[PDB]
């Protein structure tokens, strides 16, 4: 039987196949609303390295509804994909992208060395190296203020114990696995005492 025939399918394509992604410190969030989401396209794909879901089953929510779904996309390196998970610490989890301990959603990642590497080294993807405090869950800091590492205070000038807070990844195609770039999509689900707009094709 041909079907189902759905027109307002959720735009997971323009998130997963976006020609250009975003740096992890300025991670990009896509709000999913007023659409039917066929998550089978996600887990039936054979082009993902990691598909870790927390507190929710991706094979069991195509008959479920949610008030809103958020799609967060960014780029890190293979060593840091394990940090996109609840209860993790490190440069990415503390200063770039933090997930709550009761995180409900999936962390999808795949190698993007063919896309985000240049022979001269790709230096467009940045990550935050220092910050005066850890990030709260789903917090986004884009400030470029000079980090004061010592007693003396910097006047927006870079120098002794005064660091620019953003460092670039050195994505060259010859890097080993773990230093080549990985594109990451983080789907998060919320359910409030409000109408639901993101449902599966079943109901």
């Amino acid at each position, epitope marked *: 039987e041909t079907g189902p025939n759905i027109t307002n399918l959720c735009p997971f394509g323009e998130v997963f196949n976006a020609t250009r992604f975003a740096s992890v410190y300025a991670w990009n969030r896509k709000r999913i609303s007023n659409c039917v989401a066929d998550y089978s396209v996600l*887990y039936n794909s054979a082009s993902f390295s990691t*598909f*870790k879901c927390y*507190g*929710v089953s991706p094979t069991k929510l195509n008959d479920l509804c949610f008030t809103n779904v958020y799609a967060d996309s960014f780029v890190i390196r293979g060593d840091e994909v*394990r940090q996109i998970a609840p209860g993790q610490t490190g440069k990415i989890a503390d200063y770039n992208y933090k997930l709550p301990d*009761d995180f409900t959603g*999936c962390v999808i990642a795949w190698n993007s060395n063919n896309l985000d590497s240049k022979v001269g080294g790709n230096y467009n993807y940045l990550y935050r190296l220092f910050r005066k405090s850890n990030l709260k869950p789903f917090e986004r800091d884009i400030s470029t203020e000079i980090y004061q590492a010592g007693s003396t205070p910097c006047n927006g000038v870079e120098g002794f114990n005064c660091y620019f807070p953003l460092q670039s990844y050195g994505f060259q195609p010859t890097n080993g696995v773990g230093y080549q770039p990985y594109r990451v999509v983080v789907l998060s*689900f919320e359910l409030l005492h409000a109408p639901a707009t993101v449902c599966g094709p079943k109901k």
Partner: antibody
Amino acid sequence: TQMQLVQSGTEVKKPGESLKISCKGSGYGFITYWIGWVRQMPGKGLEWMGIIYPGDSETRYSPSFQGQVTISADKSINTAYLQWSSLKASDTAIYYCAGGSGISTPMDVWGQGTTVTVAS
Amino acid sequence: DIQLTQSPDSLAVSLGERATINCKSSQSVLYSSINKNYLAWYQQKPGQPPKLLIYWASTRESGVPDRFSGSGSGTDFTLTISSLQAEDVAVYYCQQYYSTPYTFGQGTKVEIKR
């Protein structure tokens, strides 16, 4: 069916020998599945041993089985493993592998169990 | 580390009557994002793997009769078999999947009273 877990055959081993039993997931979408191991001693309840995500081999153990067993996985063949290095007589039990797409999700698929006997 | 205690250990109920099993958790299992308790109920029979009956404290798994129902919130949960039948005689475990390590209840035996 979304996923079926086939388990290795019955094992009759001697005290001191090593053993490795398998649990192969048959179905699509296995990239999302986490496989756990449950021990059920003869006439006793269910004991959750550990769980592993084959995609990156993240492994969590129960404090009662930390260091006593080794839960590995081979993501290229959708197979998870549970192995001992030195079998005791107190290891005689049936071992179920249970799967579920995601972590902190219900174990909604089970194999028919592997019965291990450490005696003559 | 969450510990579960079931009660009673043994339960005898006549055919067609209501059987209720209680499960107490040493800690809450409530996810705030999706207001759901991460508590499951399993049934096991001799020579058979455990069968998932109820998850999210009160949601029925496929292939489960309508007479199985779960309830509760916080630390007290209840499995209710209304109109107890012959093939419902089994051992019932409550499992929490809030966080690892996963833990089971000690088990509740349910028999027919005649």
